[PDB]
Amino acid sequence: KILFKNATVFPITSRPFKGDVLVSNGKVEKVGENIEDPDAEIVDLTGKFLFPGFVDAHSHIGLFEEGVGYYYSDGNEATDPVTPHVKALDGFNPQDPAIERALAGGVTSVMIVPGSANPVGGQGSVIKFRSIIVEECIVKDPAGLKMAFGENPKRVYGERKQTPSTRMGTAGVIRDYFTKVKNYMKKKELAQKEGKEFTETDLKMEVGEMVLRKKIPARMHAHRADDILTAIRIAEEFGFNLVIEHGTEAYKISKVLAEKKIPVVVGPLLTFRTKLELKDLTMETIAKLLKDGVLIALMCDHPVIPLEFATVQAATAMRYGAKEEDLLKILTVNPAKILGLEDRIGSIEPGKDADLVVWSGHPFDMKSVVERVYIDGVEVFRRE
């Protein structure tokens, strides 16, 4: 049992205050101005700040090992445009040196996900940085089915002289995949009602079926406004849930996204516009999408921006009209909600996971450093 004393506490779902946080059984037990417990180990946080761990809703950390070279990346199975059966989990390296660096940047939970080479790329999972054993890191698995639109999938397969080489082809590949999923489901239901054992189980079809049954969302990479809309059209044609990844030009169509309640994981933003489809990338997108009532989270898209610099990217958005309150939300409670985990992470409230970061100062002040990180109430990082 741990009693944190006298911090400036930032619960996020409530206003900041000077006070105390009691942790037991891996959870936040009590939050408030004054707390006593004669049997709790007391950690004196006088002059420090206490935040929830930051949550990155889209990351390739562990998949693209740091300090080693591009050749070793495990993040894109770019040998087949339709790889839903592969799992980011099976490529995740919990000893990647990026992970300790991310903890030193205050980040505790991420959605690990394949990249954007494939129209259908594979399964993502939500993990916490709590163990070198990936199975102990699992919060939610599978968490989503990654898909991709725009320049990346058509570049990769165009180079292979293979379908898709155009945006039309990318959409066709995905539509063709789900058409087959539906056939597969009908065959399953036919077997079940004939009381016969299904003998045609198919790993790729099974994952498709999960999406169609809304067990997990599609996680749809799209930058240019028309690619975002195409992703939405396909989701609606097949009746599945979606999240837009990046959504670089989401601001151009923010009214539609707001009305439909499609969430957007924006970012990477503190970065060069390397592609044509990125030409209209802007940090103003945060203020713009918030103003129009779209639910957003902010990603580093690690390795594009190192996860350790999540607070650096967030803070910088203050130069482009974003407010601190909101900036904290898109790193905490918003990504948690987008990942279906708002009852567990992203804020300091009784009953939620004790994922807590002790900062020397406000996290958006570049003088501030991470002193301690706790995940489920277990210290996993200490500065020095």
Add this chain to the structure above:
Amino acid sequence: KILFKNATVFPITSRPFKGDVLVSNGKVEKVGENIEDPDAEIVDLTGKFLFPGFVDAHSHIGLFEEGVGYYYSDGNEATDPVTPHVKALDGFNPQDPAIERALAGGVTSVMIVPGSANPVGGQGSVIKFRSIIVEECIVKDPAGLKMAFGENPKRVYGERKQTPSTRMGTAGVIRDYFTKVKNYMKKKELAQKEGKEFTETDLKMEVGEMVLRKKIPARMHAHRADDILTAIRIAEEFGFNLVIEHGTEAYKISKVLAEKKIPVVVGPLLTFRTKLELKDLTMETIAKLLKDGVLIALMCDHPVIPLEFATVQAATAMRYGAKEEDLLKILTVNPAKILGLEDRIGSIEPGKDADLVVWSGHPFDMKSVVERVYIDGVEVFRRE
């Protein structure tokens, strides 16, 4: 409600005249000599010319983005000779800067369609330039199945060392495809007869069936006269509707086309004869086909010729025996008819869509400019 006053009105379906057009609920409500409405907003067109929007029955605008480079084109899924399932709609960029230029050239509606790389290319859609959301632009979707004959498909697959590399092979690929569609339809009918559920739905086959059921026409690219006749033989063999795209050598066989009432979308004509199959291209084809009573429309085949210059290409045919009246019809009522949209677009008549272009003088006078464009009664363009 909008009242256009004192224009030289060109309804196309009747002779031009000095008068007025009243617009309400997106439609042409009244057209005649003296319209009065004290509630309508009055737009004074003294000294101006009022036309319907031009209609290009075959375009790749929005698929091949302007000012960007060939490599980014979305118009040809050239990785498989049979791609009926892909849609031009899914590669169409409503922010393509060619579109604002097409409006400045008086063009308001087009058929967007895949290119001619593939024996079976994918689906077209009729759209208007009314929004940045492609779903709001849709008039008719799907509108046709694009197919291709002659040098282009055999070159593309010939380079790939893949069937088809000859005209024989090209016809074979298409005939094979439709044989498969009939088989697919036979299986559905056999399933129904047997009281069994059908579980072999196939996206590629479904589009074929729409064609065989005459829900949509084949839009068949053919230049050389023998290629045009092969297209017709296949259409007749399988009992589907067709339109001929380009029909460069249609004039050599115009009596057959007129008898069978095969429409031809001629063009591009204001263009270099880049290929052997284009050696006999001639702007005289307009006068020739119209003389023999073939239904024709004129395309720019954008981007071969920019859509902004549709009136330029048309005006230029006056050097080769085509009359002004007819030239206007092949940009308005004829393409509207060929697209199955003659009761919505192509003319200024009560009940039709209020797609209207204010010109400074006659569109075939190289001094004339577009001052305003309305689509469905909404201003979408105004000269600076």
Add this chain to the structure above:
Amino acid sequence: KILFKNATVFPITSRPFKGDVLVSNGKVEKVGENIEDPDAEIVDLTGKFLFPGFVDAHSHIGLFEEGVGYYYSDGNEATDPVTPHVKALDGFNPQDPAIERALAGGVTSVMIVPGSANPVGGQGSVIKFRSIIVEECIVKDPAGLKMAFGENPKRVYGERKQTPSTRMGTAGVIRDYFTKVKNYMKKKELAQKEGKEFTETDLKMEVGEMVLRKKIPARMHAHRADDILTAIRIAEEFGFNLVIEHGTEAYKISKVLAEKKIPVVVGPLLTFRTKLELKDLTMETIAKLLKDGVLIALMCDHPVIPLEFATVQAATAMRYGAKEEDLLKILTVNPAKILGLEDRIGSIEPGKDADLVVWSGHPFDMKSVVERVYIDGVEVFRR
């Protein structure tokens, strides 16, 4: 004549103070407590911060156009491991949309340079963002000869099945180039003291000659400690001046660089360690190298980090032991010195160029914005 009044002025070469700056003839005329001038246009900077323009000593802005695609990059002539004759100047697009963004980040002067594909890559130039005509932007041309060691050159030519595919080969290519330069110089002096006019002028050799005569430094890309030492060994062998680019592991050998007075343009630092040779990259490098007395500047290596975010990267190093005073120096006075331009840019002093930026608050505060930018006393940007 322009008189900026009542900003918090940051001269860099002395403490910040509340006061005035007077500009005439493209230059800083006066800096002080209370300045009057009847002919000066008054610009009231109450509540504002006045800084020199930041200077990035190593950039590929304009060479790698933003918003367009890697395919259009003009930054690496990766078809020949020895291209000293090419000029970053000849691939620079003054209309790159990154440039207006760099101004909005308070950066006014950069050295444009080829990348690190080639053991010998081509010539750098110092420019200012003052014009859409590159010739009017030129401050110093040529400013340096770019060379590269470590993984990049051996990867590029290795993939081409061409020398160099190893570190041994990269060093061999450069040594061989300068051996040829020396021969060239001897042939010129043989012609010089005969009757004959020299008939074997060679662009590639001419540039090499400038380096050996110490007219311009070698600008040497190196990350791993041994690569930095190899670069120094070659410079000493042929007697030329050098600057280390990146110098990722410079901190491991800082006493030597200090002793030999080798400057280091550190960075990119706010970035992922994409390579084996970047495994020990650390923002702690700034504090370490300063402690040990190495002259350093900080680069974004744009586009690796956008130049607009130059202050973001610098501010972030305070999280790794670096102090604000030093962080401003490595963005202003130190890069000016490394470029041989400390008489002209990098600080607010009488006689220096009027490259000045009006900030809404301190540049290391993420809420602060660039309101105005002057280059040579002409306003080139307004928020």
